[PDB]
Scaffold this motif. Structure first.
Motif, PDB file in Angstrom:
ATOM      1  N   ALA A 143       0.737  -0.849   0.169  1.00 40.15           N
ATOM      2  CA  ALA A 143       0.420   0.148  -0.218  1.00 40.15           C
ATOM      3  C   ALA A 143       1.072   1.221   0.068  1.00 40.15           C
ATOM      4  N   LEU A 144       1.780   1.273   1.268  1.00 41.47           N
ATOM      5  CA  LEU A 144       2.875   2.088   1.061  1.00 41.47           C
ATOM      6  C   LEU A 144       3.632   2.221  -0.453  1.00 41.47           C
ATOM      7  N   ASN A 145       3.707   0.886  -1.083  1.00 38.54           N
ATOM      8  CA  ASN A 145       5.153   1.293  -2.288  1.00 38.54           C
ATOM      9  C   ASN A 145       4.214   1.523  -3.572  1.00 38.54           C
ATOM     10  N   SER A 146       2.866   1.218  -3.941  1.00 33.03           N
ATOM     11  CA  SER A 146       2.158   2.049  -4.283  1.00 33.03           C
ATOM     12  C   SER A 146       1.760   3.567  -3.930  1.00 33.03           C
ATOM     13  N   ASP A 147       1.471   4.319  -2.830  1.00 30.50           N
ATOM     14  CA  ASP A 147       1.217   6.038  -2.537  1.00 30.50           C
ATOM     15  C   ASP A 147       2.947   5.918  -3.400  1.00 30.50           C
ATOM     16  N   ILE A 148       3.958   5.066  -3.421  1.00 33.73           N
ATOM     17  CA  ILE A 148       5.439   5.817  -2.769  1.00 33.73           C
ATOM     18  C   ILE A 148       5.553   6.053  -4.923  1.00 33.73           C
ATOM     19  N   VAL A 149       5.474   5.176  -5.426  1.00 34.66           N
ATOM     20  CA  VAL A 149       4.426   5.142  -6.758  1.00 34.66           C
ATOM     21  C   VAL A 149       4.189   6.678  -7.131  1.00 34.66           C
ATOM     22  N   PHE A 150       2.763   6.533  -6.755  1.00 32.33           N
ATOM     23  CA  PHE A 150       2.526   8.217  -7.213  1.00 32.33           C
ATOM     24  C   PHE A 150       3.178   9.080  -7.073  1.00 32.33           C
ATOM     25  N   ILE A 151       4.186   9.151  -6.082  1.00 34.56           N
ATOM     26  CA  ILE A 151       5.260  10.236  -5.161  1.00 34.56           C
ATOM     27  C   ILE A 151       5.812  10.255  -6.245  1.00 34.56           C
ATOM     28  N   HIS A 152       6.422   8.189  -6.784  1.00 41.79           N
ATOM     29  CA  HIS A 152       7.487   9.068  -8.429  1.00 41.79           C
ATOM     30  C   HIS A 152       7.437   9.337  -9.109  1.00 41.79           C
ATOM     31  N   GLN A 153       6.603   9.097 -10.105  1.00 39.82           N
ATOM     32  CA  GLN A 153       5.817  10.132 -11.088  1.00 39.82           C
ATOM     33  C   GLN A 153       5.546  11.470 -11.422  1.00 39.82           C
ATOM     34  N   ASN A 154       5.386  11.388  -9.621  1.00 40.24           N
ATOM     35  CA  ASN A 154       4.602  13.379  -9.696  1.00 40.24           C
ATOM     36  C   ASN A 154       5.349  14.168  -8.703  1.00 40.24           C
ATOM     37  N   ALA A 155       6.751  13.784  -8.477  1.00 40.39           N
ATOM     38  CA  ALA A 155       7.265  14.208  -6.833  1.00 40.39           C
ATOM     39  C   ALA A 155       8.397  15.248  -8.092  1.00 40.39           C
ATOM     40  N   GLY A 156       8.955  14.813  -8.198  1.00 37.13           N
ATOM     41  CA  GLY A 156      10.077  15.870  -9.501  1.00 37.13           C
ATOM     42  C   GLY A 156       9.020  16.762 -10.164  1.00 37.13           C
ATOM     43  N   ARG A 157       8.034  16.966 -10.722  1.00 36.79           N
ATOM     44  CA  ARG A 157       6.830  17.579 -11.223  1.00 36.79           C
ATOM     45  C   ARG A 157       6.491  18.321 -10.331  1.00 36.79           C
ATOM     46  N   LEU A 158       6.288  18.330  -9.195  1.00 41.80           N
ATOM     47  CA  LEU A 158       5.523  19.720  -8.458  1.00 41.80           C
ATOM     48  C   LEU A 158       7.194  19.363  -7.338  1.00 41.80           C
ATOM     49  N   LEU A 159       7.930  19.225  -7.100  1.00 42.71           N
ATOM     50  CA  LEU A 159       9.273  19.679  -6.522  1.00 42.71           C
ATOM     51  C   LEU A 159       9.942  20.871  -7.663  1.00 42.71           C
ATOM     52  N   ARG A 160       9.842  20.651  -9.083  1.00 44.74           N
ATOM     53  CA  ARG A 160      10.341  21.270 -10.218  1.00 44.74           C
ATOM     54  C   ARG A 160       9.415  22.977 -10.371  1.00 44.74           C
ATOM     55  N   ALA A 161       7.985  22.400 -10.456  1.00 48.01           N
ATOM     56  CA  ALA A 161       7.096  23.435  -9.977  1.00 48.01           C
ATOM     57  C   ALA A 161       7.070  24.922  -8.959  1.00 48.01           C
ATOM     58  N   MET A 162       7.079  24.481  -7.788  1.00 47.78           N
ATOM     59  CA  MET A 162       7.667  24.908  -6.841  1.00 47.78           C
ATOM     60  C   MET A 162       9.093  25.442  -6.518  1.00 47.78           C
ATOM     61  N   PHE A 163      10.483  25.296  -7.069  1.00 46.75           N
ATOM     62  CA  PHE A 163      11.434  25.609  -7.941  1.00 46.75           C
ATOM     63  C   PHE A 163      11.194  26.676  -8.733  1.00 46.75           C
ATOM     64  N   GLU A 164      10.238  26.846  -9.532  1.00 48.63           N
ATOM     65  CA  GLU A 164      10.273  27.812 -11.433  1.00 48.63           C
ATOM     66  C   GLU A 164       9.392  28.968 -10.046  1.00 48.63           C
ATOM     67  N   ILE A 165       8.634  28.417  -9.726  1.00 46.23           N
ATOM     68  CA  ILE A 165       7.476  29.604  -8.513  1.00 46.23           C
ATOM     69  C   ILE A 165       8.564  30.767  -7.710  1.00 46.23           C
ATOM     70  N   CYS A 166       9.383  30.006  -7.368  1.00 46.14           N
ATOM     71  CA  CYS A 166      10.060  30.742  -5.871  1.00 46.14           C
ATOM     72  C   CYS A 166      11.377  31.249  -6.883  1.00 46.14           C
ATOM     73  N   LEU A 167      11.661  30.553  -7.873  1.00 45.68           N
ATOM     74  CA  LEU A 167      12.095  31.557  -8.738  1.00 45.68           C
ATOM     75  C   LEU A 167      12.535  33.073  -9.501  1.00 45.68           C
ATOM     76  N   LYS A 168      10.843  33.072  -9.692  1.00 47.49           N
ATOM     77  CA  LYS A 168       9.907  33.745 -10.441  1.00 47.49           C
ATOM     78  C   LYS A 168      10.249  34.484  -9.149  1.00 47.49           C
ATOM     79  N   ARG A 169       9.875  34.404  -8.364  1.00 47.05           N
ATOM     80  CA  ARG A 169       9.836  35.365  -7.013  1.00 47.05           C
ATOM     81  C   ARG A 169      10.882  36.030  -6.172  1.00 47.05           C
ATOM     82  N   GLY A 170      12.073  35.745  -7.249  1.00 48.77           N
ATOM     83  CA  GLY A 170      13.210  35.991  -6.552  1.00 48.77           C
ATOM     84  C   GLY A 170      13.180  35.474  -4.407  1.00 48.77           C
TER      85      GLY A 170
END
Lengths: 82, 522, 75, 99, 77, 70, 73, 92, 135, 36
Positions: free
Chosen positions: I11-38
């Motif tokens: 069950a945990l491993n399924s959730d962490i699969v979801f996090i595997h596929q979408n995690a770098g996405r979300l994090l990368r988004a947050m990074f770009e947002i902060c970069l725009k914010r300065g």
RNA sequence: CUCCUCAUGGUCAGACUAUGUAGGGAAUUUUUGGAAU
């Protein structure tokens, strides 16, 4: 050097059979095998493609002319399994 | 239909404009614009000098690629200014397509004035060399007083932070400036441009700084020439040395010029040294000189770069031959041949016949048909044979005639002061009499593949072949029909010495007139 | 390059069989890294009955690349 | 330069190799060794009546010629080794440019 | 008991007529004097003649460079 | 070729003869050692049990995956 | 020693003919150049098969390995 | 230096025929060891005479139960081994 | 997931699969947002996190892990050796690297891979164009 | 840590007292919690 | 991908093994064909 060259050097002192590019078969005791596959052989019985068979004392054939060798099964144990 | 693609775009109402075009074709485009036939015109950056008054202007991309930098770099605000002067109305309209990083830079310095600065701090080595050669600056005090006249000076006072001088004050300025000029002088004395000795202080000029400063070639280029050039050097090496220079920073490349250089290298007489970098503009200069020696059908992109190179090279090649003379190597002959090749556009061994303007394979064959080897046999020819050989247009025939006329059959003669009394290590003056076929009306050199105009000159050469030692050289501009020139040259060591004099033109190939004579020195 | 160990065959009468079903008999004289052989008292055995003495004392050279095999007549 | 490198580029390509013995080979190149030894998969092979074989390794010297797809980009594939050699091979006044 | 290259060298000096057996060809053999040779056993052979065995006839060839790969057996006549 | 190790392989020779055996080792020249190798000629007809054999790389034409290892 | 390479160099710029090992082809033409591995380049070449003129080929390259011998004509 | 000498020797040697073929994009005819001929344009070459040939037309000779007939086919993209080359002829 | 934990209870491993596929996405988004914010504090740490989602490891796990050819024993040894990364990067002599990583074997390989790791000698000279604008 | 020992220095941004760089032991213990 | 050479780091008393901006895998025993019919 080649790993099969290493085996073939282990085959010295045994009875092997040799087929040359001509097709003649030489069976006998292998005296010496060089790195270039040149082989020295003793007490050879020879079967020609026509079927005639002869006996000769000492024969030495060039590596390049050998189609293939058959060596005894004793060597199959080791150490080429690795 | 010149500019092989200019047809199809222009047919639908968008014109093409770039440098290197067929001029007629360009002019047709411009006329269409003025008359309203083409409502849109696409102009490349370098053509901002061609000012086509517009009602509106669009600027697509602020980034242009140069290979030398190895990345795109944004345009100068100067270029953008020359790019916004074209458009005026009903209302002047300028669209500038830019990045976010460059937005604040263009949006400010276009609307508000350009702060002006001075880059002398980069060229100070060359500039101070020049001053020392002119001997206006006798000492270091003299140079500082000379730097008092600079726009640089005023600038370093108003904005010292830009130039890296931390102290802002009269004393601080003085100290920093003297530091800079001191560093300059060390580079020059180490590079043998000058020499400094205590007695205010005395500075003298050497043979390197003389020529470098006179021709105006930069310090760094000269230092590179010094490092590479030695005795027993070949023509390929000389050409490489020529290609490595700072003057070629202004020759642009986008990615295609370099890849196409690789593809072009199959067809070329020479092969770039393995231990330098291909992307550097030097390699491109090398191959475009190859394409100048062999007349390839070049893309119109590369024609411009060839033109730029040619505008630089003549001083550079002069420096190459003269620096070898200064180092006293008889191989300066090969440098002279290379210079001739640069003025003309043909190789030395390939064919002398191709030197005459507007010759091609077929026409050369007729010269083999009449069994002509040198160019001097063309001068003895008469009109009927010439008409048979060349069937071509009148302007080209005229240029050929002018070539033949101003290319002199000049004879080389010498008169020595004393053949009996020959002393070793003495300054022995020779008087060489030179005489010309026809006295020139003007000295213009005629060449098709070298668009810029040249005045003819000559080099008188004395040296011994086996030792590869050049004893004497002098440059002369022969305006008169017959003159005499005195080479003051030190004699070699004792014994029998072969001395071979060349008369080698700077422009025209196969003009080499030689006389060999040997003297016994005591 | 390796040298064949033919020293045991030196100065021995041998029958070389060679490419093209050729057979010659002669005393082994020289050799080299190349297996190229010098034979003295060389006798060609032609296809039928005759043999010709090609090189009695003048000897001969056989290309090692053409040498199929070599039989020792002596011991 | 070395055309064998050009063959190395040819992985996952469907080719028909004629051989010195006259044999015709049809298959997708999995790899070619520098010896020009070619390992292929999904191969139909016709000796001079086709035999279907999962994998076939051919010794390079036996290869007569290899017929490539017409879609292949030879302009792009031929120029590599020169660029690799150039990569292996690889002052005030710097800014010709200003402000 | 001499190396073959030395044997060829004594053919060179003696200038004896030389008969070469070629490779896999019994029908024809080449003949002539050895004026020189190289490390690859390529031989410049003067007054060379092609000798088809199949009484023997032959074609006079003059000066020849014979490649060493053909060489099966070099001899003297 | 290393993946093919220990497998039963079919090697086609220069003369057209077909050899089948376990591939124990190879080398640069592609000289192969084949355990329990048998020879087939025409296609079973004229099949012989050779045993352990070396084959020269100069003679080898091609090799194919015959069966899985013992 | 007069080596095959110098003899061949002197043979350059002369009419030659080359008999291949197959003897199925002979080539008679001017010898333009030969490389260190002894490949042959001929010009105005003519092909003689079975001793008869097959045709005039022109500028031709002969793989070294096929050459039986070269003679001057 | 060694590289330079190799390229130059290649340029002025017999190799000049296949070099000239690549630069001029001219057709050449190659007599091969299979008794087949390839008339094509030389896209690339090698010291071994390995070649990339375009617009290949190969011609061969076949015998039947009556008069000998010539046969030919077109191969647009062909890569060739270097040993099959008997002869490379350049012509008008 | 950053630490490479596969699991038994899936069950945990399924959730962490979801996090595997979408995690770098979300994090990368947050990074770009902060970069725009300065914003300086978040942007660097977020960039490290994005890198950790991409390459699946921590900062304290050495960057030699993301090489495909670098062996396991070596990376364990460096993790346990408690040494600043700059020192290993500054080491040049290959034998000296093998001694520093205390295994004589593989040292040459490690040094080769170091010269394959990004290393920059970076300099900057600022200078004002005018009082407001700084180049 | 060495109370008297030499260290090179540089300009930069300092880290948090508890920050990933300052707590490396925790990652080996964290992955070591599940083990292997 | 493989073998050699070279370099290298290590180990053993020249050999072995990992790595390499390395050189290479057309002139007699192997991969640039004496095959073709």
């Amino acid at each position: 050097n080649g790993i099969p060259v290493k085996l073939l050097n282990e085959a010295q002192g045994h009875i092997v059979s040799l087929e040359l590019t001509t097709g003649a078969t030489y069976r006998g005791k292998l005296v010496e095998s060089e790195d270039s596959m040149n082989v020295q052989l003793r007490d050879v019985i020879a079967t020609e493609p026509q079927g005639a068979v002869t006996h000769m004392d000492q024969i030495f054939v060039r590596g390049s002319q050998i189609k293939f060798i058959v060596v005894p099964d004793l060597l199959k144990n080791a150490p080429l399994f690795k | 239909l010149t500019d092989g693609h200019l047809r199809a775009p222009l047919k639908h109402g968008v014109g093409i404009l770039y440098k290197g075009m067929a001029s007629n074709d360009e002019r047709i485009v411009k006329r269409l614009y003025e008359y309203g036939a083409v409502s849109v015109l696409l102009i490349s950056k370098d053509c901002s000098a061609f000012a086509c008054k517009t009602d509106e202007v669009i600027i697509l991309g602020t980034n242009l690629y140069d290979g030398a930098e190895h990345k795109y770099m944004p345009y100068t605000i100067n270029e953008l200014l020359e790019m916004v002067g074209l458009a005026s109305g009903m209302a002047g309209k300028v669209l500038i397509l830019t990045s976010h990083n460059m937005k604040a830079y263009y949006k400010k310095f276009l609307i508000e004035p350009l702060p002006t600065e001075s880059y002398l701090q980069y060229i100070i080595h060359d500039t101070l060399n020049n001053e020392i050669a002119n001997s206006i600056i006798q000492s270091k005090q003299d140079c500082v007083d000379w730097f008092t006249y600079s726009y640089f000076y005023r600038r370093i006072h108003v904005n010292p932070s830009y130039y890296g001088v931390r102290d802002t004050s009269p004393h601080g300025i003085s100290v920093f400036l003297s530091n800079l000029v001191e560093t300059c002088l060390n580079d020059l004395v180490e590079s043998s441009f000058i020499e400094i000795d205590d007695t205010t202080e005395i500075i003298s000029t050497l043979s390197n700084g003389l020529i470098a400063s006179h021709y105006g070639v930069s310090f760094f280029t000269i230092q590179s020439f010094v490092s590479s050039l030695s005795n027993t050097s070949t023509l390929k090496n000389m050409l490489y040395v020529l290609s490595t220079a700072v003057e070629f920073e202004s020759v642009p490349l986008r990615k295609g010029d370099r890849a196409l250089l690789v593809k072009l290298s199959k067809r070329l007489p020479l092969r770039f040294p393995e231990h330098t970098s291909s992307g550097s503009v030097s390699f491109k200069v090398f191959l475009l000189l190859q394409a100048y020696f062999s007349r390839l059908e070049l893309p119109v992109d590369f024609q411009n770069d060839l033109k730029d190179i040619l505008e630089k090279v003549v001083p550079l090649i002069n420096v190459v031959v003269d620096i070898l003379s200064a180092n006293g190597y008889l191989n300066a002959t090969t440098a002279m041949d290379l210079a001739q090749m640069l003025i003309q556009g043909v190789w030395d061994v390939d064919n002398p016949l191709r030197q005459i303007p507007h010759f091609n394979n077929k026409i050369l064959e007729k010269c083999k048909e009449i069994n002509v080897e040198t160019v001097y046999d063309i001068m003895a020819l008469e009109d009927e044979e010439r008409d048979e050989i060349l069937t071509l247009t009148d302007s080209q025939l005229a240029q050929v005639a002018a070539f033949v006329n101003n290319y002199p059959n000049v004879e080389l003669t010498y008169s020595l002061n004393n053949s009996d009394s020959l002393i070793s290590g003495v300054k022995q003056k020779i008087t060489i009499q030179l005489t010309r076929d026809v006295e020139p009306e003007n000295l213009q050199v005629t060449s098709e593949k070298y668009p810029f105009d040249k005045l003819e000159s000559w080099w008188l050469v004395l040296g011994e072949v086996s030792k590869k030692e050049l004893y004497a050289i002098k440059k002369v501009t022969l305006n008169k029909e017959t003159q005499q020139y005195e080479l003051e040259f030190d004699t070699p060591t004792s014994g029998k010495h072969n001395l071979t004099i060349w008369c080698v033109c700077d422009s025209y190939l196969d003009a080499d007139k030689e006389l060999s004579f040997e003297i016994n020195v005591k | 390059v390796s040298t064949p160990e033919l020293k045991k065959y030196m100065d021995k009468k041998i029958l070389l069989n060679i490419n093209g079903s050729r057979k010659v008999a002669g005393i082994l004289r020289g050799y080299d890294i190349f297996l190229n052989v010098v034979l003295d008292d060389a006798m060609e055995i032609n296809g039928e009955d005759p043999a010709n003495n090609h090189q009695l004392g003048l000897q001969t050279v056989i290309r090692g690349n053409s040498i199929i095999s070599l039989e020792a007549l002596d011991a | 330069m070395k055309l064998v490198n050009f063959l190395k580029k040819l992985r996952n390509e469907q080719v028909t190799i004629e051989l010195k013995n006259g044999t015709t080979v049809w298959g997708t190149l999995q790899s070619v060794s520098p010896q020009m030894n070619a390992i292929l998969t999904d191969v139909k092979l016709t000796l001079p009546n086709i035999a279907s074989l999962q994998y076939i390794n051919i010794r390079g010297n036996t290869i007569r010629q290899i017929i490539l797809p017409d879609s292949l980009n030879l302009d792009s594939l031929l120029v590599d080794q020169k660029q690799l050699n150039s990569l292996r091979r690889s002052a005030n006044k710097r800014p010709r440019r200003g402000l | 008991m001499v190396p073959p290259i030395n044997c060829i060298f004594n053919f060179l000096q003696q200038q004896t007529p030389v008969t070469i057996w070629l490779f896999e060809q019994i029908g024809i053999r080449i003949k002539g004097k050895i004026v020189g040779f190289d490390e690859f056993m390529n031989v410049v052979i003067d007054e060379a003649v092609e000798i088809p065995v199949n009484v023997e006839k032959g074609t006079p060839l003059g000066k020849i460079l014979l490649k060493g790969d053909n060489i099966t057996l070099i001899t003297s006549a | 070729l290393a993946n093919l190790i220990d497998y039963k392989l079919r090697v086609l020779t220069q003369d057209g003869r077909v050899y089948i055996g376990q591939l124990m080792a190879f080398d640069k020249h592609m000289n192969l050692v084949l355990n329990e190798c048998i020879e087939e000629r025409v296609p079973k007809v004229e099949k012989r049990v050779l045993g352990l054999t070396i084959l020269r790389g100069e003679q080898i034409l091609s090799t194919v995956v015959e069966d899985k290892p013992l | 020693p007069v080596n095959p390479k110098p003899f061949l160099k002197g043979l350059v710029n002369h009419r030659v003919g080359v008999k291949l090992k197959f003897n199925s082809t002979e080539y008679r033409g001017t010898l333009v150049s030969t490389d260190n591995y002894f490949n042959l380049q001929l010009n105005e070449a003519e092909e003689f098969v079975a001793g008869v003129s097959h045709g005039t080929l022109g500028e031709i390259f002969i793989r070294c390995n096929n050459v039986l011998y070269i003679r001057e004509l | 230096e060694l590289e330079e000498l190799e390229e130059f020797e290649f340029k002025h040697g017999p190799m000049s025929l296949i070099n000239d073929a690549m630069v001029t994009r001219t057709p050449v005819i190659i007599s091969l060891r299979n008794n087949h001929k390839i008339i094509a344009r030389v896209k690339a070459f090698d010291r071994h005479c390995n070649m990339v040939l375009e617009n290949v037309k190969e011609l061969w000779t076949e015998k039947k139960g009556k008069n000998v007939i010539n046969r030919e086919r077109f191969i647009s993209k062909l890569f060739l081994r270097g040993d099959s080359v008997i002869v490379v002829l350049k012509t008008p | 997931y950053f630490s490479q934990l596969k699991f038994e209870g899936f069950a945990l491993n399924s959730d962490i699969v979801f996090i595997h596929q979408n995690a770098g996405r979300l994090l990368r988004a947050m990074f770009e947002i902060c970069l725009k914010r300065g914003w300086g504090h978040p942007t660097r740490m977020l960039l490290n996190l994005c890198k950790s989602a991409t390459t699946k490891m921590w900062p304290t796990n050495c960057p030699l892990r993301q090489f495909k050819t670098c062996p396991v024993e070596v990376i364990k040894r460096l993790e346990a050796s408690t040494v600043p990364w700059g020192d290993y990067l500054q080491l040049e002599t290959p034998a000296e690297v093998g001694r520093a990583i205390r295994s004589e074997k593989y040292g040459k390989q490690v040094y080769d891979l170091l010269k394959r790791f990004p290393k920059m000698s970076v300099t900057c000279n600022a200078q004002p164009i005018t009082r407001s604008v700084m180049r | 840590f060495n109370q008297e020992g030499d260290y090179n220095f540089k300009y930069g941004i300092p880290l948090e007292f508890y920050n990933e760089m300052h707590r490396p032991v925790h990652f080996l213990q964290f992955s070591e919690l599940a083990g292997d």
